[PDB]
């Protein structure tokens, strides 16, 4: 459930959301649209399949994995879009024509949206334009994204998450830098405060020679998860391919 | 249509990095100096220079 840097959040500015889009496909002859966001869908808190809810990233310095329901996600390009299906990392929906696509979660009054530009154009199949597939007509060859959840258009590669620094972990007191890990989590830290230094602290620990809070970094070793090869994360030292997951909704 | 995949970036943010040579299609790599990049804390580095 990584969170990354959307170019357009709710208000005006680029900022970090769990539901950034990064890429979009629009080649299905029906106009069905497949979207990839950093969030997940159809999985419960531990990751086990549960259609009615989804899990995503937390806006806190503990930065755990939080959850919500399907009834409060919305897709819209020019008007609201009708969701057709969802599978973990991926969404698919029908959208009206427009210039950009927006995914929005409405956790009550907590609105978090990402928008990305994509000139989606009403397309058709045949030698004549038409608004809708007519009741009567010839049956010709077309290609539409398969609504089935368990299809596969390909695979995407996932890797161990890299370092993810924080500042609540760090603190400045009387010109000395201390670390404040959360409860029971072995948090690795490093810096040069003069000479270089590294280790892991699970409790509030002091640092020597450290005069400024900006001098050091601390973060917990969360190797129990795999993250997409997103361009808005600093990867781990070893970026070996460690997981592949299917790209649902194969263009059948 | 090519899909342009951009791997996750890397920082050796007070050492030195070199762009190696890969075998990927139209592979491109480059190195930058002082960047001091922020992601969600507001600092991911020591030695801002």
């Amino acid at each position, epitope marked *: 459930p990584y969170l990354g840097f959307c170019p357009y959040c709710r208000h005006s500015a680029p900022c970090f959301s769990p539901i950034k889009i990064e890429n979009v496909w629009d080649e299905s002859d029906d106009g069905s649209i497949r979207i990839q966001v950093s969030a997940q869908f159809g999985y419960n808190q531990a990751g086990t399949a549960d259609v009615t809810k989804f899990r995503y990233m937390s806006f806190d310095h503990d930065h755990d994995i939080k959850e919500d329901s399907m009834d409060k996600i919305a897709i819209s390009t020019s008007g609201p879009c009708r969701r057709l299906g969802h599978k973990g990392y991926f969404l698919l929906a029908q959208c009206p024509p427009g210039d950009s696509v927006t995914v929005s979660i409405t956790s009550g009054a907590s609105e978090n949206s990402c928008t990305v530009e994509k000139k989606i154009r009403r397309k058709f199949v045949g030698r004549e334009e038409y608004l809708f597939p007519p009741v009567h007509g010839k049956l010709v060859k077309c290609h539409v994204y398969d609504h089935l959840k368990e299809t596969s258009a390909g695979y995407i590669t996932m890797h161990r998450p890299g370092p993810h620094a924080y500042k609540s972990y760090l603190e400045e007191a009387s010109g000395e830098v201390y670390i404040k890990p959360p409860s029971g989590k072995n948090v*690795t*830290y490093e810096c*040069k405060c003069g*000479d*270089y*230094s*590294t*280790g*892991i*602290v*699970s*409790t509030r*620990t*002091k*640092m*020597n020679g450290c005069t400024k809070a900006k001098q050091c970094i601390a973060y917990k070793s969360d190797q129990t998860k795999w993250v997409f090869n997103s361009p808005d994360l600093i990867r781990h030292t070893d970026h070996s391919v460690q997981g592949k997951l299917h790209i649902p909704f194969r263009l059948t | 249509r090519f899909h342009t995949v951009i791997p996750s970036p890397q920082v*050796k943010c007070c*050492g*030195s990095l070199e762009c190696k040579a890969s075998s990927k299609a139209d592979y491109t790599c480059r190195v930058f100096g002082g960047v001091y990049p922020f992601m969600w804390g507001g600092a991911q580095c020591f030695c801002d220079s």
Partner: antibody
Amino acid sequence: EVQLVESGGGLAKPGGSLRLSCAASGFTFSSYAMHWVRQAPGKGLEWVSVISSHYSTYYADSVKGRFTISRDNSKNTVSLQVNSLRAEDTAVYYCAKVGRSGYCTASGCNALLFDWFDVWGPGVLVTVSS
Amino acid sequence: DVVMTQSPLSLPVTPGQPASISCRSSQSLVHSNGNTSLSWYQQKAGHPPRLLIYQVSNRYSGVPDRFSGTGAGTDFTLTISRVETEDVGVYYCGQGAHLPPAFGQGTKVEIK
């Protein structure tokens, strides 16, 4: 002041086991690789094992499968569990702190591989006899 | 494993005169930084070894100036310029640039 106290040694039977502890003070304990070295009576010392600040553990060849070094940074200690005791394990064991844990170059800054041991504890005697 | 050899095994000395301890490695001990990981320690009877020299030429703090370290490659020497009575004890060279760390067998320095 930097200080290392060793404890847990004494008399033991061959084939037995014992846990040694080294409590450290006066410096950032989590920031350094801790070493166990040994010197049995009348011989030179003998490096036994090291645990990095990243919990990476290396051992001498003579101590494989029997000695396990561990560490807790919260209470500032490094321990050595010893199993399958034998006669030549009889020695004074010294808990040792490197003055420097690594150095930095243009390719980055590196871990455990050291240049010198700056601090030694008083050491604790282990005597394996029948 | 790096083999470290010291000579002489016994070095009777006289106060007021210089003395030297010679040290050979089976391998080079230079790092990528160019610093060489050789260190000289003194051990007194009933006491843990105390660092004298690190980075063959650099003297540790509080060490008397009469101690000095020289050498390169695999050949190294510790020189006492003016032996004192407290200087008796067992002197060891050790290295840390190669795993496992290796130390010289040691030289006993005693007053003639």
